[PDB]
mmCIF file of C-alpha atoms and ligand atoms in Angstrom:
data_model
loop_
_atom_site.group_PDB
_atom_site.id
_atom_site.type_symbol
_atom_site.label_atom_id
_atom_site.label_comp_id
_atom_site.label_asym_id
_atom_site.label_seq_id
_atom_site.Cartn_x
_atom_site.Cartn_y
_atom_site.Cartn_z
ATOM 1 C CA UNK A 1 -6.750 -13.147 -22.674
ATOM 2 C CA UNK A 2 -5.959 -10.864 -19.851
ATOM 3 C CA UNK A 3 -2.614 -9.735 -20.115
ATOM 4 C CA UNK A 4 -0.133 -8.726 -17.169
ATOM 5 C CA UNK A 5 0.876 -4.681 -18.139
ATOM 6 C CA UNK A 6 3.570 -2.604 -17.541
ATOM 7 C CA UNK A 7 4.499 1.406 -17.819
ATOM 8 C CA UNK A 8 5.055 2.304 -21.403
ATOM 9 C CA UNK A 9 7.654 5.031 -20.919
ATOM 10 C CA UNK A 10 10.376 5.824 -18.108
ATOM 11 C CA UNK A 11 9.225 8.795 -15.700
ATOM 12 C CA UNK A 12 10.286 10.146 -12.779
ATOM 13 C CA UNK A 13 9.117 12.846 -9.659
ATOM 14 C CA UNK A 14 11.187 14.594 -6.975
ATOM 15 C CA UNK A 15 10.074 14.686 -3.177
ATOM 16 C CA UNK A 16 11.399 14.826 0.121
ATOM 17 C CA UNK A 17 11.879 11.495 2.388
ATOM 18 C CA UNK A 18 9.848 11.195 5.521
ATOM 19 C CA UNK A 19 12.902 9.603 7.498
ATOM 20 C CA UNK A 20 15.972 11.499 5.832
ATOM 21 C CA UNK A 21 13.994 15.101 5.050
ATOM 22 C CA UNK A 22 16.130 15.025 2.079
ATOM 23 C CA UNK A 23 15.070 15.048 -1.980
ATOM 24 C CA UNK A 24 14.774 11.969 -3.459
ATOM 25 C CA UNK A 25 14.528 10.925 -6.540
ATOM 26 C CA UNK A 26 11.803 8.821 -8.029
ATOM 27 C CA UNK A 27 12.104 6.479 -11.426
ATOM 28 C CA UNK A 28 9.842 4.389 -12.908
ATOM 29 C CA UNK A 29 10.650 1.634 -15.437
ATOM 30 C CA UNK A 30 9.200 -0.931 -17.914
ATOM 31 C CA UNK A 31 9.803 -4.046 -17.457
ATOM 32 C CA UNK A 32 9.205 -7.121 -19.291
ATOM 33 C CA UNK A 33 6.327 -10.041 -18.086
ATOM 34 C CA UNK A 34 6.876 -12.096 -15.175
ATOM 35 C CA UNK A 35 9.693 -9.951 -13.730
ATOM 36 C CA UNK A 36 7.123 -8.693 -11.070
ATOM 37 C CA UNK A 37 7.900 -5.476 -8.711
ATOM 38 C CA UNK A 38 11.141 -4.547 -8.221
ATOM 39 C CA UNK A 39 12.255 -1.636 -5.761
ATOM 40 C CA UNK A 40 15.522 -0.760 -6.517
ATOM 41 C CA UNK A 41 17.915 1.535 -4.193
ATOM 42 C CA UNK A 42 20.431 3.662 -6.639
ATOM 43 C CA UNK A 43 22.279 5.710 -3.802
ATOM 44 C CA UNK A 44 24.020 2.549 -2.736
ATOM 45 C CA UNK A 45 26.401 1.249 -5.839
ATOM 46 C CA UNK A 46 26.461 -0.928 -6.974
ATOM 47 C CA UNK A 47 22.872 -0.706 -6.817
ATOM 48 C CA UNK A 48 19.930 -3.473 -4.752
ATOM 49 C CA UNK A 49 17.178 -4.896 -6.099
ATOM 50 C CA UNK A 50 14.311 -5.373 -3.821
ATOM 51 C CA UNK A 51 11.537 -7.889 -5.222
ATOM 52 C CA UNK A 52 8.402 -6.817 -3.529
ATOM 53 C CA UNK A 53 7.469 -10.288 -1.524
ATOM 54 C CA UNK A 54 5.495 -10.821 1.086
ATOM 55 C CA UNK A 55 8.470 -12.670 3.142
ATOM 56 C CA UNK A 56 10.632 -9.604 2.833
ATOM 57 C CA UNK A 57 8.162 -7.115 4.474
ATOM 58 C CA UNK A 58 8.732 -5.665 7.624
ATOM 59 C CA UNK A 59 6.510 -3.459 9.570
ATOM 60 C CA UNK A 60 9.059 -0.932 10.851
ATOM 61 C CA UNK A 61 8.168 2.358 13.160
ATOM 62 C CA UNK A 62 7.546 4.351 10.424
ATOM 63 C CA UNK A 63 5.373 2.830 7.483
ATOM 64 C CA UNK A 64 6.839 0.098 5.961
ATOM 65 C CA UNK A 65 10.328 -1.482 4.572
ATOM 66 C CA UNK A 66 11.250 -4.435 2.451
ATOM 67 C CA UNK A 67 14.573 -6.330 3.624
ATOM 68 C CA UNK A 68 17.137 -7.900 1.354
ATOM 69 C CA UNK A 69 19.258 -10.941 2.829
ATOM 70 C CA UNK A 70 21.984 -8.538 4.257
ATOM 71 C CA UNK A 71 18.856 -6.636 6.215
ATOM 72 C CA UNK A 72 19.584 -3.588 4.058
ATOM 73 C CA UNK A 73 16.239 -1.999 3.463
ATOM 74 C CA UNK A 74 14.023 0.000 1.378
ATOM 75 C CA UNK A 75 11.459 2.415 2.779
ATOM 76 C CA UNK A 76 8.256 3.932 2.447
ATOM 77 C CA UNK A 77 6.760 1.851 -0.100
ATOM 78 C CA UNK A 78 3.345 0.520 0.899
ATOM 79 C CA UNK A 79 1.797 3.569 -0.850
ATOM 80 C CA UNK A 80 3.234 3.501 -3.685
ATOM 81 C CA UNK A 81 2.623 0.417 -3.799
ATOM 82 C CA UNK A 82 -1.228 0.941 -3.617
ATOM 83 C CA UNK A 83 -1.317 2.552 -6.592
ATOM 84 C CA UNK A 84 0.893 -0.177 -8.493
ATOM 85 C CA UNK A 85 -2.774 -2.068 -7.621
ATOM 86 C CA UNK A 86 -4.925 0.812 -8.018
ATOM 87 C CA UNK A 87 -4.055 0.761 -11.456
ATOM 88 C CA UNK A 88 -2.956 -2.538 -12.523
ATOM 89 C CA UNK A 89 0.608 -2.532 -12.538
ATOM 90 C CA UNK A 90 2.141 -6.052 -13.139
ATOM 91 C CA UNK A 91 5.535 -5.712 -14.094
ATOM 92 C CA UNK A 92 7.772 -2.372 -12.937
ATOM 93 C CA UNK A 93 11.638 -1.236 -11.660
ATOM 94 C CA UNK A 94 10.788 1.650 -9.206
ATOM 95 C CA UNK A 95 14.301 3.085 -8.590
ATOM 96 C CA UNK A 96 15.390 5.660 -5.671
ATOM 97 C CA UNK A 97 18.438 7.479 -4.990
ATOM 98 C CA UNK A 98 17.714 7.185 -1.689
ATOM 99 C CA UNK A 99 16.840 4.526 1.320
ATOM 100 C CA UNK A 100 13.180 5.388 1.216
ATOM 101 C CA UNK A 101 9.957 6.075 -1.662
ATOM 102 C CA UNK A 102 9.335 9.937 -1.521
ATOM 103 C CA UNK A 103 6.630 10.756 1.062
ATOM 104 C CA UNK A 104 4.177 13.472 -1.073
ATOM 105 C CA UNK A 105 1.057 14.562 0.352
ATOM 106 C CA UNK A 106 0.931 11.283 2.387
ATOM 107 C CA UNK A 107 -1.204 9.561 0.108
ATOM 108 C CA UNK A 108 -0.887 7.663 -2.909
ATOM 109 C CA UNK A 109 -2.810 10.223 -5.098
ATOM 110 C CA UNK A 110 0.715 11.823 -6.423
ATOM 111 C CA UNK A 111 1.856 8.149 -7.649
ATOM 112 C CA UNK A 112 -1.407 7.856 -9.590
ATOM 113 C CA UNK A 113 -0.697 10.939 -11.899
ATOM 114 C CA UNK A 114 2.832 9.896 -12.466
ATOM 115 C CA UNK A 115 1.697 6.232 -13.058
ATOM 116 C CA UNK A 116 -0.622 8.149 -15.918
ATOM 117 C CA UNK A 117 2.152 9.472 -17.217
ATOM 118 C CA UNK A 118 4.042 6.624 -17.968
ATOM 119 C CA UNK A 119 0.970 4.955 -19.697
ATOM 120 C CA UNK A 120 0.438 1.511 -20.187
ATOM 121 C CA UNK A 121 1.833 -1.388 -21.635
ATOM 122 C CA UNK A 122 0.191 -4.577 -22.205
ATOM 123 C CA UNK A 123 2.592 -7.329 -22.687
ATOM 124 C CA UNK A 124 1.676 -10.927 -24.314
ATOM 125 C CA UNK A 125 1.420 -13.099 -21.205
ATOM 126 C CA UNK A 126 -1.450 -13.973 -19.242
ATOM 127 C CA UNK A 127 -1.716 -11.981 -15.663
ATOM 128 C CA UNK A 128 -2.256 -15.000 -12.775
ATOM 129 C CA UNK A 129 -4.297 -13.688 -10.107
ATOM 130 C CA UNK A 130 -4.566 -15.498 -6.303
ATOM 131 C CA UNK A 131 -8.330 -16.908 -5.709
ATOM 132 C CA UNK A 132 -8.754 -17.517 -2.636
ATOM 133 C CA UNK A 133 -10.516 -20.878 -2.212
ATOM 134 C CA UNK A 134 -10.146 -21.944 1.903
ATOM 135 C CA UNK A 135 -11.330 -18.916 4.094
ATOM 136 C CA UNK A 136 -8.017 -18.411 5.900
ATOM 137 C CA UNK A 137 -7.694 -16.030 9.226
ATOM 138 C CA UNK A 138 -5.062 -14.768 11.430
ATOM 139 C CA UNK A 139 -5.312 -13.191 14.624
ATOM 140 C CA UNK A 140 -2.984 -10.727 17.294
ATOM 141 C CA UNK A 141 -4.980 -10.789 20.326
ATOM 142 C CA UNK A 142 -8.101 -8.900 19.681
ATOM 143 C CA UNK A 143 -7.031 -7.914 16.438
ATOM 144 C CA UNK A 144 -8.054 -10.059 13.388
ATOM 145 C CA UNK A 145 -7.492 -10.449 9.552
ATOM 146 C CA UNK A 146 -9.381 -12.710 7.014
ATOM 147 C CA UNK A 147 -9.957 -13.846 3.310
ATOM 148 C CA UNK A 148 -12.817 -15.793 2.419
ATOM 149 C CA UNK A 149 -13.558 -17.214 -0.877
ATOM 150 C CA UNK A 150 -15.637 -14.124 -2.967
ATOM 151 C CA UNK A 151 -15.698 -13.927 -7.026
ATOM 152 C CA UNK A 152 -14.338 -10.479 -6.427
ATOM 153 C CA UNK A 153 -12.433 -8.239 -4.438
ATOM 154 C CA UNK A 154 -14.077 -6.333 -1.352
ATOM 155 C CA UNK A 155 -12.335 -4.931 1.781
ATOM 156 C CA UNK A 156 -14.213 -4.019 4.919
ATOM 157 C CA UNK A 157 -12.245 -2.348 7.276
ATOM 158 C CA UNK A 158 -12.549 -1.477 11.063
ATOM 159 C CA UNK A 159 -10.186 0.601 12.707
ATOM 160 C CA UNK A 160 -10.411 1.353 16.793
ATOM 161 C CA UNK A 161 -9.599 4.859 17.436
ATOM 162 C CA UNK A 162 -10.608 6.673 20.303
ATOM 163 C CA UNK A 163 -8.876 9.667 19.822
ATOM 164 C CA UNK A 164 -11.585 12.352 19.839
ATOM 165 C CA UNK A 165 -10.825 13.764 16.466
ATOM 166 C CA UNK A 166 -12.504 10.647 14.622
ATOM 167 C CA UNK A 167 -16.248 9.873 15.663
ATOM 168 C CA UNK A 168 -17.805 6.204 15.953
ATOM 169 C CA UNK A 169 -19.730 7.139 12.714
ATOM 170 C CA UNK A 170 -16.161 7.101 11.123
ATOM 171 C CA UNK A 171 -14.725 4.134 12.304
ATOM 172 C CA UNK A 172 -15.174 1.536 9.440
ATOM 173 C CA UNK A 173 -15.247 1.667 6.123
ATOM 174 C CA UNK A 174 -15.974 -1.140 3.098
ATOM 175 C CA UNK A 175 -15.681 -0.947 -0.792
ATOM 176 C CA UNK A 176 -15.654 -3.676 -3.706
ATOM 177 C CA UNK A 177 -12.369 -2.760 -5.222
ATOM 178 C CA UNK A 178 -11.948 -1.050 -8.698
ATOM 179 C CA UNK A 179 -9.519 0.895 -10.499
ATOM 180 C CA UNK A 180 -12.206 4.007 -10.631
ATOM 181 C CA UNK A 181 -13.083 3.334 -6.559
ATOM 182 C CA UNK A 182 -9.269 2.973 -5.498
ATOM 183 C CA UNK A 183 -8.901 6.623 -7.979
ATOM 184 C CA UNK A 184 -11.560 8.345 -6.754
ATOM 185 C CA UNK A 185 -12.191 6.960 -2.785
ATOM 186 C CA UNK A 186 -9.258 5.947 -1.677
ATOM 187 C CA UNK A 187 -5.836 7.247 -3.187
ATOM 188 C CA UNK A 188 -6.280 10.897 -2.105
ATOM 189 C CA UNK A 189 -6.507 9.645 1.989
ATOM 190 C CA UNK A 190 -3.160 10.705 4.151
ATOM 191 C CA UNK A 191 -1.179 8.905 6.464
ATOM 192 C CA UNK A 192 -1.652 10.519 10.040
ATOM 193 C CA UNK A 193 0.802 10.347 12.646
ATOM 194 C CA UNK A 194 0.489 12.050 16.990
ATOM 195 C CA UNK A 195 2.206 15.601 17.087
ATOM 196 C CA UNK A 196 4.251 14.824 20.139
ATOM 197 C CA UNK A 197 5.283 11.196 18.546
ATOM 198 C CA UNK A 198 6.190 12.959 15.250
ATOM 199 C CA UNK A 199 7.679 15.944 17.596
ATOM 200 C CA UNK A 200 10.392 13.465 19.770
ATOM 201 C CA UNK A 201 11.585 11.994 16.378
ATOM 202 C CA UNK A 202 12.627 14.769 15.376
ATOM 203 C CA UNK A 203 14.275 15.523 18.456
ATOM 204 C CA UNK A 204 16.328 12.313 17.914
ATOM 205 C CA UNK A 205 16.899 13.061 13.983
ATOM 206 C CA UNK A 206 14.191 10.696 12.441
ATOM 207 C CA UNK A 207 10.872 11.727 10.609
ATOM 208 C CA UNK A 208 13.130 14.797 9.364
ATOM 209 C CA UNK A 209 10.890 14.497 6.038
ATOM 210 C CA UNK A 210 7.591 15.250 8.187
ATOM 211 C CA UNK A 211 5.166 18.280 7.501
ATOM 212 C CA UNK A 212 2.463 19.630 7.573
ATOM 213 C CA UNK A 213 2.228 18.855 3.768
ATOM 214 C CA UNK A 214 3.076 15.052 4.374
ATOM 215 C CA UNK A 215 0.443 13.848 6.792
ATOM 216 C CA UNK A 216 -2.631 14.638 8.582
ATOM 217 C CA UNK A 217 -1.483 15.406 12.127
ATOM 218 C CA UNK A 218 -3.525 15.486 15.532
ATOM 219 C CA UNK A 219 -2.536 16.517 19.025
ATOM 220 C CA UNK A 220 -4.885 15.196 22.064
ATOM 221 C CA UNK A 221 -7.724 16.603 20.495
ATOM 222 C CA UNK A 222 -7.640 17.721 17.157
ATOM 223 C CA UNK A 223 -6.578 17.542 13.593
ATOM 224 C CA UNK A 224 -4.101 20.471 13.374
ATOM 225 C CA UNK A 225 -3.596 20.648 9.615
ATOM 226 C CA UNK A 226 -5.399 24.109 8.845
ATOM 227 C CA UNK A 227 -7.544 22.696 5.674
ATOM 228 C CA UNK A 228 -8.865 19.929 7.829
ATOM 229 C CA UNK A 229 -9.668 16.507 6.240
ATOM 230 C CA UNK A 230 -10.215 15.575 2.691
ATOM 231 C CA UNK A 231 -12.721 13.092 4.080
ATOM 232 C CA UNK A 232 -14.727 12.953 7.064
ATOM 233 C CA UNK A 233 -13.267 9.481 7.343
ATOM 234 C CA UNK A 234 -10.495 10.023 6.117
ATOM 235 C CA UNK A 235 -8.082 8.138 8.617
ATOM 236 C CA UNK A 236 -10.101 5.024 7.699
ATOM 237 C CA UNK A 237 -9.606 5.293 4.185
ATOM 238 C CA UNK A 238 -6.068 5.566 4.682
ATOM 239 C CA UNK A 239 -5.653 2.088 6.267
ATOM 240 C CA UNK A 240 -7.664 0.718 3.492
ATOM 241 C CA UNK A 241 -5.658 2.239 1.372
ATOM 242 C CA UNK A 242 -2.170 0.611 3.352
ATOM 243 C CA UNK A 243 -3.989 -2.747 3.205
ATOM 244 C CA UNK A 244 -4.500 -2.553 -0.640
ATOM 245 C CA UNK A 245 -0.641 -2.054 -0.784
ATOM 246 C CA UNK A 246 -0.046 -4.452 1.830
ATOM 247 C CA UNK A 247 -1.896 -7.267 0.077
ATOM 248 C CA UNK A 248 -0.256 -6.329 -3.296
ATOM 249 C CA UNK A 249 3.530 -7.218 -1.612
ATOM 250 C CA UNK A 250 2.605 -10.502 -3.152
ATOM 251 C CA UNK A 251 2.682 -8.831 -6.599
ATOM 252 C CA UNK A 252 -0.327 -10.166 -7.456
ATOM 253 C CA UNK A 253 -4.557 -9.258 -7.394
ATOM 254 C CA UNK A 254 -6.378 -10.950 -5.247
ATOM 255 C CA UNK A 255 -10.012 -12.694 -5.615
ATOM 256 C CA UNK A 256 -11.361 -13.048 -2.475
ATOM 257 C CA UNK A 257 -13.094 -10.891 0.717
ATOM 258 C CA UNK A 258 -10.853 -9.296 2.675
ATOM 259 C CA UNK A 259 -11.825 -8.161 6.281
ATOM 260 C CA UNK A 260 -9.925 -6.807 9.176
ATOM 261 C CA UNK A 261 -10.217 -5.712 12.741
ATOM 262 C CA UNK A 262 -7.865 -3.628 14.098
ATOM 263 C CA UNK A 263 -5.353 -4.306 11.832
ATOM 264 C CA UNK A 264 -2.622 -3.054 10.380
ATOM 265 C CA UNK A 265 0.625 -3.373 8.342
ATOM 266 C CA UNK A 266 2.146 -6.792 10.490
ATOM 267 C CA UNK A 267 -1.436 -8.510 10.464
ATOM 268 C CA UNK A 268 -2.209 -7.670 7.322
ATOM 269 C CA UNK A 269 1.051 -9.168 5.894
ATOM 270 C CA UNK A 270 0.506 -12.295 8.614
ATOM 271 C CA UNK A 271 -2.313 -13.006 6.913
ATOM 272 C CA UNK A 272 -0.704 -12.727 3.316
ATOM 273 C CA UNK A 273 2.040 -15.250 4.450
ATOM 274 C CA UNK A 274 -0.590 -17.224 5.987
ATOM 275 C CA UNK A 275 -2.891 -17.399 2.456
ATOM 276 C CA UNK A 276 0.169 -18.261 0.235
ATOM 277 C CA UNK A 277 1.561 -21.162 2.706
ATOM 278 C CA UNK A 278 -1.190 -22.813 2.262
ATOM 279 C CA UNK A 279 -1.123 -24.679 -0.765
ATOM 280 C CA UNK A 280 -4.579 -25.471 -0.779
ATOM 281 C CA UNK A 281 -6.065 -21.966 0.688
ATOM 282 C CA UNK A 282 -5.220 -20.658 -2.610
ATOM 283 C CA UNK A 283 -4.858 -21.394 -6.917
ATOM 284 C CA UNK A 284 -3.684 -18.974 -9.549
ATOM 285 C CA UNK A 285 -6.429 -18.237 -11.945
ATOM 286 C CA UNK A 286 -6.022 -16.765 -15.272
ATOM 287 C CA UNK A 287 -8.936 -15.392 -17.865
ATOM 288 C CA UNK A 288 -8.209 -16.126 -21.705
ATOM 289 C CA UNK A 289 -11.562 -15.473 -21.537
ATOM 290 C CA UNK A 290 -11.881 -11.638 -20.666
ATOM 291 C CA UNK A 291 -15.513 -11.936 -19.483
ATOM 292 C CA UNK A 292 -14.493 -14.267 -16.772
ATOM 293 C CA UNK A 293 -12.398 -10.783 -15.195
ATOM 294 C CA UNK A 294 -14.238 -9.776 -11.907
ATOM 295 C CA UNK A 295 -15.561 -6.695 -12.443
ATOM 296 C CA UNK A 296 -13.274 -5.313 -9.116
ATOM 297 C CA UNK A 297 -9.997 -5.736 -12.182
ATOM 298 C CA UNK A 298 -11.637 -4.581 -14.835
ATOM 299 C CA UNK A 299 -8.739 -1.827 -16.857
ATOM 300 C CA UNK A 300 -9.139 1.792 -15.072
HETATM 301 C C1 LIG B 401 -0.720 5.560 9.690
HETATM 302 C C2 LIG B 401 0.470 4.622 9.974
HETATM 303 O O1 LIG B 401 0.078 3.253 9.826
HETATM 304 C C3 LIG B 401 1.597 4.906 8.975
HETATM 305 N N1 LIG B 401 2.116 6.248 9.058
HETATM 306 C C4 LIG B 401 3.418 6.509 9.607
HETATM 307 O O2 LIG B 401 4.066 5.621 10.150
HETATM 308 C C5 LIG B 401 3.755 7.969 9.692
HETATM 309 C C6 LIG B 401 4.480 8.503 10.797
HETATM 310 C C7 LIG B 401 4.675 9.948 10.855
HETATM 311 C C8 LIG B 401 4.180 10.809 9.811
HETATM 312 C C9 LIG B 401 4.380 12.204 9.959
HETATM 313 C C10 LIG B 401 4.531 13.372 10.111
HETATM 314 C C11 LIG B 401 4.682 14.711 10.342
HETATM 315 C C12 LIG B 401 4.799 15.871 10.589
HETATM 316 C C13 LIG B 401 4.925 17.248 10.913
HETATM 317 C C14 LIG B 401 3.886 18.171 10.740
HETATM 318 C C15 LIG B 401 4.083 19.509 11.089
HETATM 319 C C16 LIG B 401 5.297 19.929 11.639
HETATM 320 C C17 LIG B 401 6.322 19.012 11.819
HETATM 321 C C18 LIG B 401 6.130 17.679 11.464
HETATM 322 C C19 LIG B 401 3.467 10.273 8.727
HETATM 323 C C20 LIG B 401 3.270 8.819 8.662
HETATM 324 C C21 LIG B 401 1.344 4.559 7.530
HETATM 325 O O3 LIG B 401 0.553 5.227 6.831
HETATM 326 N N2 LIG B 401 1.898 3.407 6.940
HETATM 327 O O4 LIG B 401 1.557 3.179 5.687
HETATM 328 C C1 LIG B 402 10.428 6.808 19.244
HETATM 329 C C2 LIG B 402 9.274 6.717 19.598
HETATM 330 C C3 LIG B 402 7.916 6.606 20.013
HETATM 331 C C4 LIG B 402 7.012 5.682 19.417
HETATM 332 C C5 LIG B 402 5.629 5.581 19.900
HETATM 333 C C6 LIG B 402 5.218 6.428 20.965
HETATM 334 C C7 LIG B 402 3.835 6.326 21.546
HETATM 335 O O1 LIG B 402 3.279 5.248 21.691
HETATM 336 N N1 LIG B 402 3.290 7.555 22.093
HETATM 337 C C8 LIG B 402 2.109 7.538 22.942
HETATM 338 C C9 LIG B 402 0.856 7.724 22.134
HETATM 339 O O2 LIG B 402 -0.209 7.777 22.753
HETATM 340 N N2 LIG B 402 0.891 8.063 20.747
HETATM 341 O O3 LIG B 402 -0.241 8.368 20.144
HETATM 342 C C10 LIG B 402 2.231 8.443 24.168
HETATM 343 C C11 LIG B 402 3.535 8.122 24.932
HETATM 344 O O4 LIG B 402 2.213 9.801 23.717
HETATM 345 C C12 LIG B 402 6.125 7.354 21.568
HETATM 346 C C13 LIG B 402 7.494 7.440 21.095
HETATM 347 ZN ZN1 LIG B 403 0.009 4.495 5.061
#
């Protein structure tokens, strides 16, 4: 049987805050099966739990947010949350003493080390996985999302830049998910963000966390880090990777082929809420039998 896992040991990792500049604090926790992902904010006491759902998402100016009933919110966590699927994270308390996930690099490479660290934990309790069974699309003008039925998992991407810094040769980009492809392809590629954007934030007191050592950042016509990119495509990668975290909100893998145009956090989470209100789009699916596992969930 496939079981759902959690972390076998409490961790935790110190970084600044994109929004508040500040340091936060990062924990990680066990947690027993079926409990899901739970963000949990520790600055405010008594403390809030946020279960990651797709209903609670909202696609705010910078990154993302989940929303409790009141509309107090947790920050930053789409990348994280990447990882959480990257490497097969069922059940887990993420705790911060602060409104927002640290920022790191920008990517969700720092979360992967730390998710090492805390090991694994498989737990005795089968891990349900959403097949998509009814292809199922949702649209935003000329922007699109889909999931078709697929005995797998496989993204395929297109973003529509036109910013000279990233060249028609790097506009799309399309993998069959694994742990060891989400490691190695995707978890190292950084959030990007317009100088002069980034710039009038801070003018007004927001983005205070941003740098250099954050985000890949461009003016009019170039990429002004002083390294460069990690990957010719890399601002591709990155919204692949922030689609993998999107799509996880529901806490659960999906079996099916993903594809997107233009999209982004909103669509990409329309098209979540669209799958699961369907009652017939979708089944849960489990594997006592471990051969039955699509390769794309095999362990990392
Ligand atoms: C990609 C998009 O969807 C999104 N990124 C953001 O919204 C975003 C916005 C701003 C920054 C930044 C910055 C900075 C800076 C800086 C550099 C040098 C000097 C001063 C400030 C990073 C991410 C995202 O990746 N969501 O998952
Ligand atoms: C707060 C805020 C804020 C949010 C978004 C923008 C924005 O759309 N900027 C434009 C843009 O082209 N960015 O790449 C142009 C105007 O540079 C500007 C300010
Ligand atoms: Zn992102």
């Amino acid at each position: 049987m496939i079981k759902q896992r959690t972390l076998k040991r409490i961790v935790q990792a110190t970084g600044v805050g994109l929004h508040t500049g500040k340091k936060v604090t990062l924990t990680l926790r066990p947690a027993p099966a079926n409990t899901g992902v739970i963000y949990r904010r520790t600055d405010l006491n008594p403390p809030v739990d946020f279960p990651a759902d797709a209903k609670s998402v909202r696609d705010t100016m910078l990154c993302t947010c989940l929303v409790n009933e009141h509309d107090v919110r947790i920050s930053t966590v789409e990348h994280l949350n990447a990882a959480l699927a990257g490497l097969g994270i069922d059940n887990i308390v993420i705790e911060v003493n602060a409104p927002e996930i640290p920022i790191m690099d920008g990517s969700a490479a720092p979360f992967v080390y730390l998710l090492l660290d805390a090991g694994i934990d498989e737990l005795n309790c089968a891990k349900k996985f959403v097949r998509i069974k009814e292809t199922v699309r949702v649209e935003d003008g000329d922007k699109w999302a889909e999931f078709k039925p697929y005995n797998g998992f496989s993204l395929d991407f297109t973003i529509d830049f036109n910013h000279p810094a990233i060249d028609s040769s790097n506009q799309r980009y399309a993998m069959n998910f694994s742990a060891d492809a989400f490691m190695r392809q995707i978890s190292r590629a950084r959030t990007f963000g317009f100088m002069r954007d980034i710039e009038y934030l801070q003018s007004r007191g927001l983005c205070l966390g941003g740098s250099f050592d954050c985000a890949i950042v461009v003016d009019d016509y170039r990429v002004l880090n002083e390294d460069g990119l990690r990957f010719e495509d890399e601002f591709v990668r990155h919204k692949m990777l922030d689609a993998i975290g999107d799509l996880f909100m529901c806490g659960h893998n999906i079996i099916g082929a993903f594809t997107a145009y233009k999209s982004g956090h909103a669509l990409n989470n329309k098209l979540l809420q669209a799958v699961l209100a369907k009652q017939e789009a979708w089944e849960y699916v489990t594997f006592q039998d471990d051969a039955e596992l699509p390769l794309a969930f095999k362990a990392p």
